[PDB]
Design an enzyme around this catalytic site. Structure first.
Site, PDB file in Angstrom:
ATOM      1  N   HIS A 184      15.868  34.332 -30.863  1.00 37.14           N
ATOM      2  CA  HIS A 184      16.720  33.115 -30.891  1.00 37.14           C
ATOM      3  C   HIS A 184      16.726  32.326 -29.575  1.00 37.14           C
ATOM      4  O   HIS A 184      17.343  31.247 -29.550  1.00 37.14           O
ATOM      5  CB  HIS A 184      18.136  33.529 -31.280  1.00 37.14           C
ATOM      6  CG  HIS A 184      18.213  34.038 -32.672  1.00 37.14           C
ATOM      7  ND1 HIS A 184      17.901  33.243 -33.751  1.00 37.14           N
ATOM      8  CD2 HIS A 184      18.550  35.248 -33.165  1.00 37.14           C
ATOM      9  CE1 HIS A 184      18.058  33.941 -34.863  1.00 37.14           C
ATOM     10  NE2 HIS A 184      18.449  35.178 -34.530  1.00 37.14           N
ATOM     11  N   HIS A 229      -6.893  18.462 -21.919  1.00 36.18           N
ATOM     12  CA  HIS A 229      -7.507  19.765 -21.556  1.00 36.18           C
ATOM     13  C   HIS A 229      -6.917  20.238 -20.227  1.00 36.18           C
ATOM     14  O   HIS A 229      -6.676  19.398 -19.338  1.00 36.18           O
ATOM     15  CB  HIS A 229      -9.049  19.679 -21.466  1.00 36.18           C
ATOM     16  CG  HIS A 229      -9.760  19.432 -22.757  1.00 36.18           C
ATOM     17  ND1 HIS A 229      -9.783  20.352 -23.790  1.00 36.18           N
ATOM     18  CD2 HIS A 229     -10.505  18.381 -23.180  1.00 36.18           C
ATOM     19  CE1 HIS A 229     -10.482  19.866 -24.797  1.00 36.18           C
ATOM     20  NE2 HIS A 229     -10.948  18.664 -24.444  1.00 36.18           N
TER      21      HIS A 229
END
EC number: 3.1.27.-
Lengths: 104, 104
Positions: free
Chosen positions: A10, A97
């Site tokens: 969570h 990239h």
């Protein structure tokens, strides 16, 4: 059922990347190495602000980096934590990239 | 190859949880719903400070929540982002269960 399990289930955020668990996901598929930038997207995206052509651009400032590097054991990693400049391919004013740490 | 993939592969402080990557791992096993708290563990842990007996406690303050919900396609998710109070089971001063968003 416990704090550490609750955290994993969570809570989305630790600078401490869990390499063995994240590098084994479908996206990384147990590749030898990945660098993680502990940053909001906007400052990273700003690196490529005003760059239209494809260009390799080194950051002018340092970010918090987690490098996951494979050991002799398949898909088992060691984590290196550092701050450094890094290099991205900019295209249409966004990073496309990750080129490298400290140098293009 | 593009800014979305760049983000998924290299950016580690995002509210855009990579649902499709995370929801297939062992802990989530492609279940239909999970709520993620965009936070570090300390302020989440703090919700249960001095709460010893098993107890459902709504936060007195909002957190950023990223809800992974399954699409019409199994183990493929949309992301719903919001701020809200949420409910936890506290035990031994740590949340151990996520009970729900906005209400116990």
């Amino acid at each position: 059922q416990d704090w550490l399990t609750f955290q994993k289930k969570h809570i989305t955020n630790t600078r401490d990347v869990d390499c063995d668990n994240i590098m084994s996901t479908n996206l990384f598929h147990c590749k030898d190495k990945n660098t993680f930038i502990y940053s909001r997207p906007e400052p990273v995206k700003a690196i490529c602000k005003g760059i239209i052509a494809s260009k390799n651009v080194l950051t002018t400032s340092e970010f918090y980096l987690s490098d996951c590097n494979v050991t002799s054991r398949p898909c088992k990693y060691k984590l290196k934590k550092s701050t450094n400049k890094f290099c991205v391919t900019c295209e249409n004013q966004a990073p496309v990239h990750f080129v490298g740490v400290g140098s293009c």
